[PDB]
Structures are given as C-alpha cells and as structure tokens.
Amino acid sequence: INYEPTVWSRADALKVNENDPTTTQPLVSADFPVMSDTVFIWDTMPLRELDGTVVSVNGWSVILTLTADRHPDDPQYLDANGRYDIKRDWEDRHGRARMCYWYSRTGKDWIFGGRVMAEGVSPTTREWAGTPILLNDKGDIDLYYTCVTPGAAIAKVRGRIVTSDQGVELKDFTQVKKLFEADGTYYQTEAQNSSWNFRDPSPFIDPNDGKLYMVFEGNVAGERGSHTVGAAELGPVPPGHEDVGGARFQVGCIGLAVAKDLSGEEWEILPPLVTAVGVNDQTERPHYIFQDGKYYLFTISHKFTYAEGLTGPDGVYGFVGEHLFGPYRPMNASGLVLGNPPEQPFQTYSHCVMPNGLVTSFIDSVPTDGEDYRIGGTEAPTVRIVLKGDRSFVQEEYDYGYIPAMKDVQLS
Amino acid sequence: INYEPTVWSRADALKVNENDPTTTQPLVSADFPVMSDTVFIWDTMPLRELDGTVVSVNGWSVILTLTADRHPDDPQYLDANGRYDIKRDWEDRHGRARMCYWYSRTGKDWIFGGRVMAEGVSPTTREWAGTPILLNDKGDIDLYYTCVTPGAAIAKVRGRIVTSDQGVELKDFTQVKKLFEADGTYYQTEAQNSSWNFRDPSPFIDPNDGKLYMVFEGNVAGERGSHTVGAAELGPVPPGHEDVGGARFQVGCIGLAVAKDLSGEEWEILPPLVTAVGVNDQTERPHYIFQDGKYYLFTISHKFTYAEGLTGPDGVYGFVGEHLFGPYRPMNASGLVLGNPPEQPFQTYSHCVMPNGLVTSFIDSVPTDGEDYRIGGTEAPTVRIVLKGDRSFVQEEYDYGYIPAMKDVQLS
C-alpha cells in the first residue's frame, strides 16, 4: 500500500472547543474510591476479541492494567516532615510499569490477579501498553504490548487463561517475540529524535478484507526539527493565525501495520494513516470501533503536547472514514471526542472507547482545596458516548471502573 | 416526493461555539463608511443565474437591496432635545421596505439605480427579500420576492435590464404574480400562528435532475404551542440538558418547492427539508452552493430566536448533503458557519454566500464607547470562506460591499 495520510491540520485543531457539553468528560468527585491501596494502576486494557468485542471467560470479566507499587512507608518517599510524597511516587510509576490482570463476575470491584509475565520474561523491565486478545475458546491469549528502554519495540507474548469458581489465572506467558520497531522512513527513530514515540499496538481483523492489522502510536519520520509545516499542515487558518512558531517539533501520527498472515507472527509496516505535524506530538493508544459501515479511529492526546499557537484538552480524539486506508475526517469537525473539563483538566486519562459505547479511563489528578489536589491511580467512572455519522455525544455515567462483558466465552 | 426532513436537534445546537476563530466574522470597525446618506439598505441580493453564478451585464455589476429612506430632519424622529432618533428610524425600515437596485463597473462603490417596481405595482406595500434572476442574454429578469402584510406570499415579477456607457436601468416590472403561500399541512399559517414565518424565495436549477426548484423560509405546520419536542428534536443531549422549557414555541424550517416546468409560472410545495423545532424559530434567506459533488444549504439565524436552554450567535448556519432531498449534516458539527464575534454580536446580518466563496452582509449595530453604538444600514466588508467536506473556514476580508461578478453576460 502507498496511500497518502490524512492530515489533522492546525485549522482543524483551531476548532477544538473545551467548553462543549456534548464532548466533555463528567466531573470526577474528589471523594473517589481507590481500587487498591498497594498498587497504582493507569492505562487499562480489557480482554477482547480481534473484532473489538470485550469478552468474559466462563462468566469472569478480565482486564489488564499498567501497574506499579505504592510506597507509602518507604523512606525514599518520606520528606523532611515525615509526609509521604505521593506525587513523586505516582510520577515514578512509568519506570516500574508492569502488566497485571484483574477479574470480576460483575465488570467492577476488580480482584487483583497479579503479574501477567514473571519478572525477567519481558526483554525490557518496563512493560508498556497494548492489547490482550482472546484467540479462541480453548483460552489461548496473545498479549500485544510495548517493550521500552533500551529502544522501543512492539512485541507479543502467547499465554492462556484458566478459570474456576474461585477466580481466574493467566499463565504460560514465557516467550516474548519482538515484532517491529520504528524504521526511519515512515516512523521516526530514536536516532532522529531521542524523545521519539513508538508504542501501543491495537490489533484487529479488518471487517472488509478479513486481514489482521494493527494501529499504533508513531511519529512522522525525519530528523527532529526538519519537518515542514506547509500548506497542508497549516490548513485554511483564519487571518492572524499564520505564524506557527516551533510547531515543526510536534510530529505525532497513528501508524498501521499488516500481519503477513492471521497468526500475527510476522508483520509489515505501512505508511502513517493520520499525521499531526505542526499540531500535536502525541497520538497515543489508537484504537477502532467499526459501526454503521464506518471506521472510527480514536486516539488519546494531551494539552501539553499541542504545538505553539494551539490549545486543547487532555482526552480522546477521533477520525472517521469509510475505508481502512482513508481518507478520514476529524470527529466533531475539530477531532475532539471527549475532553477533560477545564475546571479539572487532568482528572482522567487514557480513554478506551469500547464498541458498546462505554469509555473507561483512569483518574490522574483531581483538585480539592486551594491549589491542592488528590492523585488517583485508580479507575474513573465509565461514561457512554454515542456516535452519529461524523459526530459524537456524551451520555450517562456509570460506576468507577465498570467494564462489562459484551459477550461471554465458555472454555472448551 | 415524501422524504423525511433532516432535524437540526438541540444536541447539535449544544455544539455551537461562538469563540471559534475559523467560524467568526471579522470585527467591523466603528469608522465604517456609509453607502448612502439618504437611504438605509439591508438584505442584499446579487443579480445571478439559476445555477448560482453572480453575473454582470455588459460589464456592469448589479445588486438589489431592501431599502428605506433615512429621515434625519423629519420632526417625527427628532426628540425633545432636537436629537435625531436614528435607532427608531432604522427600526421602522421594515414597514417601508422597497426593492431598489444599484450598479457598478467594479463590484463596489455602488451607484443608486432607484426602485425596481413603481409604487403600487406590488400587491403589498412592503417588498421583502428574494432573488433577482438573469434569465437570458436578451436581458430578461425574473425577480422572486416576498409580498407581506396582509398575509405572506412568495411572488415573482418579470422585467428587463438595459445598459449604456452611462449606467443600468431595470424596467418593465409591472405585473406581479403570487406563486404560493403557507398551506397549513407542511408549512405553518397565520391562522396557526400570528407570528408565522413564510418568505425569501431562492430559485435554482438542480445540478442532478435539471428541474427548477426553490428554497425558502417556513415554519413547521401546526397550531402554535402544539409541536412535540421529542427524542428526534432533543437529540442525544448530555446529562442535565433534558429540560427544554418553552422550546416547542420555536419551529423554524427550510422549505422546498418545485416549479411545474422551467418557466417557473406555477409551483408545487414540497415537505420541509431541514427542521429546527425546539431549536430556533428562524431559518431565514436559505440558499445553496453546489460544490465538490455536494449541496451546501446556508441559512441565517438570530441569537434571540433560539429556544430556551440553547445559545448561539447571529450569523449564517449551514447543512450539507449529497442529495437535494437529504439527508443533510450540520456544517462544522453544530451548524454554525459564520457567527458574529461576541464582542460585537449584532455588527452584521443577512450573510449571502456566493459560489466564489465570498460572503456579503450588511452592518447593523457596532459598539463605539460605553454602552453606545453606531447604526449601519450599509454594506459590511465581504469575507471569503472555504468549504472542505462538511466544514468551513473563514479566510481574508475584502472592501465594504464588494460583490464582484463571476461571469459577464453581453446582451444580444
């Protein structure tokens, strides 16, 4: 394939509205419950099939989380006044990230299952995000995830789930295979940019051609600082908006790759599908919903990774089209699908939109009193969106961390 | 035809953003020039062909305006301090409205041509808006306009244009034929609502079937107060937005009619194309652009005719689709195409979007100093928009009242 990417332009991004009640995340209460007092969780990945369906197994719902320990009694986090520096502990989570699983009969009130992989199985100590796929009714699972530092590679590891009346166990995740890394012609490398982004596999079977593909976060290849913000990247901005400052340093994209067959053992990279040069450096955790004859491609991004001269909220953005290879259109004209409320701009992150319309996210920082705030590291209230053509609309909210099964699979 | 209308819902209208720089009219300077110190003008109607092309004749650009005299020395407008009450004179224009024409070799600096029709030719003293159509290269014109009070009827009157090196004359507009009025089953009548809207013919030849049609402003038929704001009219509003108050009293729609042949002597009304029940009472001066395989249907509306619980600016709104009979989608997700800036919310009105992308409007009220303001009754700066799929983007601004010809027609 040699398709041209869809450009999310600066003029599109000028339409972002942080004050639109149809695209704003409901406020999180400062009295939120926490799902564990021994671990933090953040990016959450429901067990699913390749067509997107979120599944239970023998009546058990299952989710994976990036996870790190809480250290409330560790001297390295106790300050000179003996106060626990929970902000520092929370910020240190990324370097200690490991994949854990949780299970529940109800889709909430999650029971901790522990590590997916034994320590030392992963080629990198950090285990960053991806997707767990239930392959069949024998309980075989492929976990697609990101190995980071040194380098960054999308990888997979095969294992299995077994259950009983007492709970769920994931086991036999012992051999990680790296699948691919940034190439330097389509996706930017560490050599081209020490802060390059390359991560977050989201595999699926295409509803039109029946092949196995994945989307992932990349950056547009090229030496940092060399990218052109030209007419296509600027788009039809209004008078006064022609100066882009240092916008060339923001080069996020959603990448695509195709498996050479349905085993997903070996992959070919394909050119970027959606590019945000001059607009935002991060289009993270891309994923699809396939509904009404359309491809809805969602991705999460941050207020602080926008280019100079633009502003937008942390939250989830989206692009829609009728063909896998595009062209796509920005959802709601600007691209924004669900943004945090400007009064609590960092309350939630890592929205995962599931085909039943429910969106899960985790709680990051919620203001309390004065300039004071509470750190979450726990699931936020799930909220439903509905999609109508190229637009979306937020609907009602559900319990903290509610991720119900769309289908139950009984093991053979 | 029995097609279902496209509904512009309350949830769509919740997306309106008065602060979007890609959809905001440039600010009008309080030092604007006035095109006449003897008449006010407002709604402006360029001479055009049925395919939308704005035309000059023998090198002369021609526009029609609704027009009323200025009365700066009339005792009825001089207050007890001898100050001229220009606000009252300006507000009294509607009851004195008459169709005048203007001409220019440059598309600006308009020369006054005087009345189109002699007094007493029109069945009603008020001559309200419509469209002047150049029928052929012999200089035959059909003027479609609105006869109001008593009642409201869409009407037409045939005449001709002749020119010389000295200027333009329109003449022989002597026999007005009323074409149709509100029926009571599709469009609301005076009996159903003393404030019913029915006006503003915009005729065109359909690019797909070659028939002559027109759009116009209507209201959805039914007794005032009886209309249902149900699930379709509310749309997928977010939590907290379910109460609609008195929204059932706002029932604007864009109507459509088809000529029984290309003479446009006799017409059949068709069901509403776009309805705004529970959203806005006024979808005025509807008109099309046909571009990129799509129908772009523009209409002007007011801040003050929105239903309870919604807010939006005076300006032009739009809907886009691939088929004359729909369904259509709201432009820019909310419907807003060009809104007045919230600092000058009443600076311009009656946007007419022409197929070269230029938009003409008139100046209404521009703030000066304190709670003080200046009344216009003259043309505003023309501004260009570009259309890209279901979105629009404001571009550069031009001189006051610049309405250049897209094509010149030499008379035979």
Sequential DSSP letters for B194-232: TT---EEEEEEE-TTT--EEEEEEEEBSS-TT-----HH
Q: How far apart are CA B390 and CA A325, in angstroms?
A: 20
CA nearest neighbour of B15 among B394, B333, B319: B333
Q: Please answer whether residues B267 and B258 qualify as being in contact, where contact means their C-beta atoms are separated by less than 8 angstroms.
A: yes
CB pairs under 8 A, 24+ apart, for A147-151?
A147/A122, A147/A123, A147/A176, A147/A178, A148/A124, A148/A199, A149/A95, A149/A124, A149/A125, A150/A124, A151/A181, A151/A190
Q: Which two tokens stand for residue B281?
A: 């009472």
User: Maximum Cα–Cα distance for chain B, whole Å?
Assistant: 66
Q: Which two tokens stand for residue A340?
A: 């945090």
Determine whether the interchain pair B394/A238 forms a contact, defined as Cβ–Cβ distance below 8 Å: yes
Q: Please answer whether residues A278 and A305 qualify as being in contact, where contact means their C-beta atoms are separated by less than 8 angstroms.
A: no
- Cβ-Cβ contacts under 8 Å for A318 (sequence gap 6 or more): A296, A297, A298, A299, A330, A331, A332, A335, A337, A353, A392
Q: Which two tokens stand for residue A177?
A: 């295979």
- Cβ-Cβ contacts under 8 Å for A295 (sequence gap 6 or more): A288, A320, A321, A322, A323, A324, A328
Left (φ > 0), alpha (ψ -120 to 50) or beta: where does A82 sit?
left
Q: How far apart are CA A99 and CA A111, in angstroms?
A: 15
Nearest to B333 among A239, A241, A333 (CB): A333
Strand partners, A163: A168
DSSP string, A149-174: SSSEEEEEEEEEEEEETTEEEEE---
Pick out the residues of the known binding site of A.
42-43, 129, 199-200
Residues in chain B: 412
Strand partners, B254: B217, B274
Q: How far apart are CA A383 and CA A400, in angstroms?
A: 10
Q: How many CB pairs under 8 A join A and B?
A: 84
Instruction: Compute φ and ψ for A333, nearest 5 degrees.
Output: 75, -40
3-state SS class at B281: coil
> What is the count of structural domains for chain B?
1
Helix, strand, coil percentages in chain B from 3-state DSSP, rounded to 5: 5, 45, 45
Among chain A, residues having any CB pair with chain B shorter than 8 Å are 11-12, 14-15, 17, 19-24, 26, 235-241, 329, 332-334, 386, 388-391, 393-397
Q: How far apart are CA B165 and CA A387, in angstroms?
A: 60
Specify the DSSP element, H or E, that contains B233: helix B231-234
Q: Which two tokens stand for residue A347?
A: 């309350």
Q: Which two tokens stand for residue A143?
A: 């976990």
Q: Which two tokens stand for residue A386?
A: 């509905």
A284 catalytic? Reply is yes
3-state SS class at B45: strand
Q: How far apart are CA A157 and CA A21, in angstroms?
A: 41
**B42 in a known ligand binding site:** yes
CA dihedral B270, B273, B279, B283 (to 10 degrees): -80
Among chain B, residues having any CB pair with chain A shorter than 8 Å are 11-12, 14-15, 17, 19-24, 26, 235-241, 329, 332-334, 386, 388-391, 393-397
Rounded to 5°, angle at Cα B250 from B311 and B124: 115
In a domain, A104, yes or no: yes
In a domain, B108, yes or no: yes
Q: How far apart are CA A59 and CA A404, in angstroms?
A: 11
Distances (CA, A) of A100 to A43, A44, A64, A122, A357: 11, 10, 6, 13, 25
Q: Please answer whether residues A358 and A366 qualify as being in contact, where contact means their C-beta atoms are separated by less than 8 angstroms.
A: no
DSSP state of A220: B
Nearest to A394 among B12, B238, B397 (CB): B238
Q: Please answer whether residues A387 and A394 qualify as being in contact, where contact means their C-beta atoms are separated by less than 8 angstroms.
A: no
Q: Which two tokens stand for residue B325?
A: 């009979």
Which residue blocks in B25-147 are alpha helix, DSSP H?
Answer: 86-91
- Cβ-Cβ contacts under 8 Å for B76 (sequence gap 6 or more): none
Q: How many CB atoms lie within 10 A of CB A194?
A: 7
CA nearest neighbour of A21 among B303, B247, B334, B25: B334
Determine whether the interchain pair B15/A24 forms a contact, defined as Cβ–Cβ distance below 8 Å: no
CA nearest neighbour of A19 among B160, B121, B17: B17
Q: Which two tokens stand for residue B406?
A: 């897209």
Letter string b/e over residues A164-179, b meaning 16 or more CB atoms within 10 A of that residue's CB: eeeebebeebeebeeb
- Cβ-Cβ contacts under 8 Å for A404 (sequence gap 6 or more): A54, A61, A106, A107, A356, A358
Specify the DSSP element, H or E, that contains B11: helix B10-13
Q: Please answer whether residues B283 and B299 qualify as being in contact, where contact means their C-beta atoms are separated by less than 8 angstroms.
A: yes
Specify the DSSP element, H or E, that contains A47: none
* Burial group, residue B65, by CB count within 10 angstroms (0-12, 13-18, 19+): buried
Q: Beta strand pairing status for A60-69 and A98-104?
A: antiparallel
3-state SS class at A87: helix
In a domain, B372, yes or no: yes
Distances (CA, A) of B50 to B1, B95, B163: 22, 29, 21
CA nearest neighbour of A305 among A276, A282, A284, A330: A282
**B199 in a known ligand binding site:** yes
Specify the DSSP element, H or E, that contains A273: strand A267-277
Q: Identify the closest residue of chain B to A327 by CA–CA distance.
A: B389
Q: Please answer whether residues B401 and B110 qualify as being in contact, where contact means their C-beta atoms are separated by less than 8 angstroms.
A: yes
Q: How far apart are CA A411 and CA A165, in angstroms?
A: 13
Specify the DSSP element, H or E, that contains B12: helix B10-13
Q: Which two tokens stand for residue B315?
A: 């300006």
Q: How far apart are CA B277 and CA B7, in angstroms?
A: 8
Determine whether the interchain pair A333/B239 forms a contact, defined as Cβ–Cβ distance below 8 Å: no
CB pairs under 8 A, 24+ apart, for B225-230?
B225/B249, B227/B251, B227/B277, B227/B278, B228/B277, B229/B10, B229/B277, B229/B278
Determine whether the interchain pair A333/B391 forms a contact, defined as Cβ–Cβ distance below 8 Å: yes
Distances (CA, A) of B64 to A170, A201, A259, B170: 77, 61, 64, 11
In a domain, B1, yes or no: no
Specify the DSSP element, H or E, that contains A62: strand A60-69
Specify the DSSP element, H or E, that contains A231: helix A231-234
Q: How far apart are CA B110 and CA B39, in angstroms?
A: 13
Q: How far apart are CA B313 and CA B26, in angstroms?
A: 14
Q: Which two tokens stand for residue A72?
A: 């409330």
* Cis, bond preceding B150 (omega within 30 deg of 0): yes
Amino acid at B26: P
Q: Please answer whether residues B155 and B148 qualify as being in contact, where contact means their C-beta atoms are separated by less than 8 angstroms.
A: no
Mutate: best of A8, A10, A17, partner B, most B CBs <10 A: A17
Q: Beta strand pairing status for A381-388 and A358-367?
A: antiparallel
- Cβ-Cβ contacts under 8 Å for A281 (sequence gap 6 or more): A197, A219, A249, A250, A251, A252, A305, A307
Specify the DSSP element, H or E, that contains A234: helix A231-234
Distances (CA, A) of B39 to A295, B45, B100, B111: 56, 16, 10, 12
Measured between beta carbons, the chain A residues lying within 8 angstroms of B17 are 15, 17, 19-20
Q: How far apart are CA B80 and CA B78, in angstroms?
A: 7
Distances (CA, A) of A119 to A97, A145, B11: 12, 15, 50
Q: Please answer whether residues B204 and B50 qualify as being in contact, where contact means their C-beta atoms are separated by less than 8 angstroms.
A: yes
Rounded to 5°, angle at Cα A103 from A97 and A107: 115
- Could you identify the residue written with the tokens 């492929």? A142
Q: Identify the closest residue of chain B to A20 by CA–CA distance.
A: B15
Determine whether the interchain pair A17/B20 forms a contact, defined as Cβ–Cβ distance below 8 Å: yes
Task: Tell me which method was used to determine the 3D structure.
Answer: X-ray
Q: How far apart are CA B24 and CA B54, in angstroms?
A: 24
Q: How many CB atoms lie within 10 A of CB B269?
A: 20
Q: Please answer whether residues B159 and B186 qualify as being in contact, where contact means their C-beta atoms are separated by less than 8 angstroms.
A: no
Rounded to 5°, angle at Cα A166 from A161 and A167: 35
Distances (CA, A) of A36 to A115, A366, A378, A412, B335: 15, 18, 8, 33, 46
3-state SS class at B304: helix
Q: How far apart are CA B102 and CA B111, in angstroms?
A: 5
3-state SS class at A58: coil
CATH number at residue B274: 2.115.10.20
What radius of gyration, in Å, describes the C-alpha atoms of chain A?
21
What radius of gyration, in Å, describes the C-alpha atoms of chain B?
21
DSSP E strand boundaries for B70-139: 98-104, 111-115, 126-134
DSSP state of B86: H
Q: Which two tokens stand for residue A73?
A: 């009694």
* Cis, bond preceding B327 (omega within 30 deg of 0): yes
B243 catalytic? Reply is no
Determine whether the interchain pair A21/B396 forms a contact, defined as Cβ–Cβ distance below 8 Å: no
* Cis, bond preceding A367 (omega within 30 deg of 0): no
Strand partners, A379: A362
Positive or negative, the CA dihedral A19, A21, A23, A25 is positive
In a domain, A220, yes or no: yes
Nearest to B15 among A236, A237, A332 (CB): A332
Which position among A89, A127, A284, A314 bears the catalytic label?
A284
DSSP state of B265: S
Q: How far apart are CA B220 and CA B228, in angstroms?
A: 11
Q: Please answer whether residues A314 and A333 qualify as being in contact, where contact means their C-beta atoms are separated by less than 8 angstroms.
A: no
Q: How far apart are CA A105 and CA A101, in angstroms?
A: 14
Specify the DSSP element, H or E, that contains A91: helix A86-91
Domain that holds residue A227: 6-409
CA nearest neighbour of A277 among A253, A243, A301, A246: A253
Measured between beta carbons, the chain B residues lying within 8 angstroms of A19 are 17, 19
3-state SS class at B77: helix
In a domain, A141, yes or no: yes
In a domain, B313, yes or no: yes
Mutate: best of A22, A294, A311, partner B, most B CBs <10 A: A22
Distances (CA, A) of B113 to A108, B161, B408: 76, 11, 19
Q: Please answer whether residues B317 and B336 qualify as being in contact, where contact means their C-beta atoms are separated by less than 8 angstroms.
A: yes
Q: How many CB atoms lie within 10 A of CB A294?
A: 18
Q: Which two tokens stand for residue B259?
A: 């000529």
In a domain, A1, yes or no: no
Determine whether the interchain pair A239/B396 forms a contact, defined as Cβ–Cβ distance below 8 Å: yes
- Could you identify the residue written with the tokens 């010149």? B408
Q: How far apart are CA A242 and CA A236, in angstroms?
A: 9
Q: Which two tokens stand for residue A184?
A: 């330097």
Measured between beta carbons, the chain B residues lying within 8 angstroms of A26 are 239
Q: Which two tokens stand for residue B79?
A: 């207050």
Q: Please answer whether residues B184 and B221 qualify as being in contact, where contact means their C-beta atoms are separated by less than 8 angstroms.
A: yes
Q: Please answer whether residues B175 and B160 qualify as being in contact, where contact means their C-beta atoms are separated by less than 8 angstroms.
A: no
Q: How many CB atoms lie within 10 A of CB A348?
A: 29
Q: Please answer whether residues B132 and B43 qualify as being in contact, where contact means their C-beta atoms are separated by less than 8 angstroms.
A: no
Determine whether the interchain pair A238/B21 forms a contact, defined as Cβ–Cβ distance below 8 Å: yes
* Cis, bond preceding A150 (omega within 30 deg of 0): yes
Q: Beta strand pairing status for B6-7 and B267-277?
A: parallel
